[PDB]
Symmetry: D2
Subunit: 440 residues, 4 copies
């Protein structure tokens, strides 16, 4: 009635209740009905949410994902659950099991990748484990013995196969790989995707957050282009109608390289690996900074086919705040943009949180996935990265507004920015995980 | 390391994580390895722990239990999970499916009962539901429409078949029905149980909490006596070697009748049912008070076969504090006994909690189930009943010490009284449920 | 900017900070600027708020109030601080130091009383002291040794001088003694107070009326003319009401003090009297109740008629008990329903001082509608003592949510939640400190 | 009885209650009975503790300290309250009002300084004020308008008069100026202070030695003989040390104040100077460090030698940054290992003031081993600013667990957790209030 919010203990309990309800055994669904499989960067957040509940089970989540890693190091963005068909495109449509030389042998997966937040999840598991007993430390340390090499091959695949020209930015061949499927970031690149003869498909709820058929036809056509060259890394530059450098993905990778490097020093991993990681951390920091607006510090994506900077007003333009590297004066301008009336300081926002697209941008749509709504997962990543920059009060304020928004217990993936209405899929594992990590 | 306790939010999260991990679908195991089935009074506490997480799932827990209710109204103490054999005595040994005319038709159960805390769980679900929306109230109210009659038949079976002489005390035919299997309360009655030819069985861990073979032979022999008369209520007085009036069970039933009566008035249930419930509430209140020591107010059990009051120093002698009814001066003496050096005020206790047996009793064993250890479930029941008597500060202090003891996150069924070592089965659902209910 | 509420720890800190800032040394002001003196039932609540901070200082608060007790046992409603003349009426107007044979020496006080919540404060001090160990228990026990007799004389004066006919209800000679100055409860009794020639003496939506105040001051002239003599007041006072809310509080207080007296081995004759008064005033409260709804009525002794009004005072029997089962259920339904806590426009699930559907309701005017944290606290504490754990918890929860702006207002607008009246009110901080635990 | 710890809300309440009880009006005593005056870095911490309770009163605390600033910019370490002579040495002994040309008018102060944590307090006030809305921001901004110039003159006096050779380290003329009076850091420098004829002037395990105190007072005689003249002190002082911990705090403070100055559009020349000092003192701190372990060393200017000791001051470079990557990792390993936070007998995971394995360690003696909440607070706050979120959180967590007895002791026994020394210490309450949020 008068107050529908949960207390912190009720909220923590309900978040943990959801995470365990979404557990199929050794993988956690991204969401029970919409996304009934393991998604890659969701699984990293799930591992973060499991760490305060069970270090052993958090480690199992990353083990399951890394058992689906391709032979070339790519972590695919979906690991399908042995039995479920309530999602399209499914294993039959990707056909990676038959076409992809590098596909894993006892897992069904997609053929594209997703942001490398995984090292951040490894850090959170290790921080939790060190506060628990010796036996919990041993569990976390055995995971590192077993999976350090796999984590290196993941970072190396990105550094070498998605940055072939050592520009320090990650090339994507599908908007799905950015994690922000329908971000205005990718509109002009998608306008240059022309579907050919497209195999007959079905569907993949509220229309104001319902794909868009023309948009979805383009998503599926990129799959056809990859399948035609059997997912061969070497051929994709020649055939893909979509080739972008993702500056937000690149900044995340810079941070992840630095985090994994620090892990490798703390746990006496090979010196040559730690050196490679610090090298990539700096290269991708510099590649992010090279994209930035000279007055505001805002980061731009790059259309590799058109050879054009992509100027849009989304949360991705704050990529440099995550990895650092801007000159002092430009970073102050960028923080001013973040806090001002185009983003967190917009007067109609219910919470002091980062909308996915600026409310004043012409591309803004308050209900439409990444075109405006506030995503707890982005709140979490900015808060954690800000605390790492030393901006304790900034990170605290994001956490506090994030908890206030989450306190209805809907665990929605994203929220209407002006009304706070929970939108889209409820029961989203990574929102439960963000809440659990914040509540401590 | 320096502090192994969990914060309140971490503890609430881990308690909810455990409850969902023990969920088989529509029933929750009492404990995943020792007790991998639904136990009756555990299931009432589980429903209490589920109510803050999901009213719909809490209602499902009681629906599953009441679907196993016998045709005469008895709620059996175990409802076996369709597939599991890691417990003995199992469905084959009870043979209620073949022998018991009143056994349910599509469930396997035991042939004895357990304390009627179920109405208390119904009250907690309704209190939670009323703080949530209209749709959650509707779920709880439909449960009452569907199950009010079953709850009445349960209370009526106890009032009419286990108090045949309207003495206002419940007769038990097995110590297992008290919930306190090996309490010193039952030693002298068990000494008069002489096993005959006993069918060959196997076993049902640390020896200081390991049944006792002679004790277990007597438990199993009572089953043979019930099976020989096909669980017929009318024949058990003539054949059972164990027949006790349980004053703690009787006080719980008094409270439960009063609670269910108040529920029936609030939700406009039949007037004749509410009248019957208030009648039983007073009859069993008076029956508890009739047993009490004239100086200390301490309640005694009664051996129906020997026609002897059973004088022991266990937590059961505080039965009158739960249901009320003592003269003012004797209730003050009883509270003095509870708080003094024989129980909560004993100088060697780690927590200000109620040991199951007095540390100064000769029957005291600090590790041995109900012969001494502190059980969170008993802490919960006394705290809740005390708050209902209006003793807010007393109930608060029990809750606070209970949370301090539970804060290691072991969720043990019982704890060593002097060291606080968690004992016995870990991962006990009803301890997780007590914690969740306390934390709010 | 986006969320002006304080966390529980910030709110507890600010509450404690306010209470200490209102401390003059041995007394705490009811509110620093509007009420810069010690008020009687405010001081009991302040002692409750101090008990988690310092058992010794909570005891001092009660010691200071009891040092102002009148020779006949009466606790006066104002104990004036050494000399702020920003409050009126002050010592000169009351003239108790010269006219009242029973006034204390070396304290300046008023000549009227206020509700006896003091035993409840004593219980909370003892409960805190028992969680704090040996030397803190000794402080609280020495207080009982020092003041048990004075607390008895307070309760005896109420029972014997303000219930002369042993009706089980307290008679008041001024609406100020109810604690609810301008409650619609007293409108018809004040309407019959016709004053004579009277000696020369913020937001108007929150203060009583200038015509209402000539009546308030005229009653004082009547008491002064008979030198505040107990035996003469029934002959002269133009205002004589039996206050059923005051009476229910007294019944609870007697029961509470009787239990303290048993726990600390006070004289058996005192404990017996306290139980007798607890039962007498319980019955007196029940005798006023509507037989359908259970609602308690005040009684105008001069007019010889029941005062039927729709205020929170109707719920007096919930505090002390004693209603038949069916009639108490009906009274709870009234409390929870749309005339009170269930009114659809209330911001919080809290008890408004007057029913929003009553013609007497005024959403900003003091006791004519606003929600008072001190009433919430008293209802929640009495409900918990009845065993209504969930009802008590809901009142506490909503009271904390309402208080979490940190204004510590004495009362709030029932629809918008706007803090009203005096800010920085000591007993609102005390309520918050006791709730937060 | 079974659990004497307080809940977070009870502890926040008691902390705020203590702070207000130590308020004299415009200054807060460092501790009511042992230190009944305003101390300089205590006052900065008090301002931090007040900021959640009242931005206006936190600003007053800093306003009062800055009103005692010397004409040359120096903030003295004691500002005496109107007249409690229970502290010694007091105004008569310091004689600054008569001898010191730069002493303030109408304040009585000491003639020495203390570490410059003041800019950190200003940052916390501003951060609180920005969460509280328009009129509270205006209070904090008006403070900056009023006192920016004075804060600059404080930092300029340190940089120019206490680092005359532009070495990037602050010179001290008294161990009292380090804030760590009896730290083993100063043992060999004090051993070379040989006093002359000196004017006539609790638990001994927690206080410095009577021979140690003749040296403390002799240094004062030397300063007085040259009338506290900055230009003459290097010629006369028997004690001249470069304090690497003070220097690291200064570097942090300069950086913090530079960022404030940018955020509120202070003069560009001030901001530039503050960044220059922040970098100069960072480098000066790094120049003292052991190349294997990173541990920072103090320097005895008279003896011309590095002071190698095992105290928490060794960790100065963690506060301000600037160490090479490998050397900072080694220093963190020292901090976490068995010589400090990892010593197996420590009750809490907290930084002891002296290493328990050092021959200089004394578990009850002041800065020779005990754990000081104010050091925990400063390390945790600086660590969070380095981006070490988890390390900062662990220090805060253990500090709260240690503080949760509510003694508010200045320091604790590192093995048993026994509160030691003065209870009711304002800056321990302030630390708790800031942590609890
Ligand atoms: O078709 C929807 C899929 C495609 O991968 O994407 C959405 O749900 C995923 C699972 O929660 C997230 O990983 C993405 O970030 C989000 O955009
Ligand atoms: O053999 C052990 C069984 C027999 O029923 O009993 C124990 O575990 C049950 C399930 O947790 C509880 O219901 C009982 O109270 C407790 O004594
Ligand atoms: O006219 C104002 C005075 C006069 O007694 O009364 C008001 O303030 C008092 C001090 O807070 C309370 O004690 C009363 O309850 C409240 O009505
Ligand atoms: O001799 C005691 C004085 C003299 O300055 O110093 C101690 O108490 C001060 C007041 O709390 C602190 O400021 C110091 O840090 C601490 O060492």
């Amino acid at each position: 009635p008068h107050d529908p919010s949960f207390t912190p203990t009720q909220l923590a309990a309900r978040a943990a209740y959801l995470l365990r309800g979404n557990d199929l055994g050794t993988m956690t669904t991204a969401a029970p009905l919409l996304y009934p499989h393991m998604w890659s960067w969701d699984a990293a957040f799930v591992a973060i949410g499991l760490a305060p509940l069970s270090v052993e089970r958090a480690v199992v989540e990353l083990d399951t994902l890394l058992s689906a890693q391709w032979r070339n190091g790519m972590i695919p963005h979906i690991v399908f659950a042995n039995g479920v068909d309530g999602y399209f495109p499914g294993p039959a449509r990707w056909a990676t099991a038959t076409l992809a030389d590098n596909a894993p042998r006892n897992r069904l997966t997609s053929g594209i990748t997703q942001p490398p937040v995984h090292a951040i999840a490894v850090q959170r598991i290790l921080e939790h484990a060190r506060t628990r007993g010796r036996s919990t430390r041993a569990v976390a340390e055995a995971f590192l013995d077993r999976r350090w090499g796999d984590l290196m091959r993941w970072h190396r695949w990105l550094a070498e196969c998605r940055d072939r020209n050592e520009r320090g930015r990650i090339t994507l061949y599908h908007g799905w790989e950015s994690g922000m499927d329908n971000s205005p970031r990718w509109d002009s690149a998608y306008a240059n995707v022309v579907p050919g003869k497209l195999p007959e498909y079905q569907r993949a709820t509220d229309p104001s957050q319902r794909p868009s058929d023309g948009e979805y036809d383009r998503y599926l056509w990129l799959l056809e282009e990859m399948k035609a060259v059997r997912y061969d890394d070497e051929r994709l530059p020649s055939v893909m109608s979509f080739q972008v450098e993702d500056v937000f993905f690149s900044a995340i990778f810079s941070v992840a390289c630095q985090v994994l490097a620090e892990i490798g020093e703390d746990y006496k991993r090979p010196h040559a690996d730690v050196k490679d990681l610090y090298l990539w951390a700096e290269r991708f920091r510099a590649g992010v900074v090279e994209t930035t607006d000279q007055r505001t510090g805002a980061a731009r994506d790059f259309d590799v086919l058109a050879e054009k900077w992509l100027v849009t007003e989304t949360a991705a333009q704050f990529a440099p705040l995550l990895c650092g590297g801007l000159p002092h004066d430009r970073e102050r301008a960028l923080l001013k943009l973040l806090e001002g009336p185009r983003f967190c300081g917009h007067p109609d926002l219910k919470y002091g949180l980062i909308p996915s697209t600026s409310p004043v941008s012409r591309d803004f749509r308050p209900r439409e996935y990444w075109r405006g709504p506030v995503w707890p997962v982005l709140t979490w990543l900015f808060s954690w990265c800000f605390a790492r920059r030393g901006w304790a009060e900034r990170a605290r304020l994001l956490r506090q507004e994030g908890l206030r928004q989450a306190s209805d217990g809907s665990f929605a993936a994203y929220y209407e920015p002006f009304t706070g209405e929970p939108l889209g899929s409820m029961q989203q594992s990574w929102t439960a995980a963000a809440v659990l990590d914040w509540l401590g």
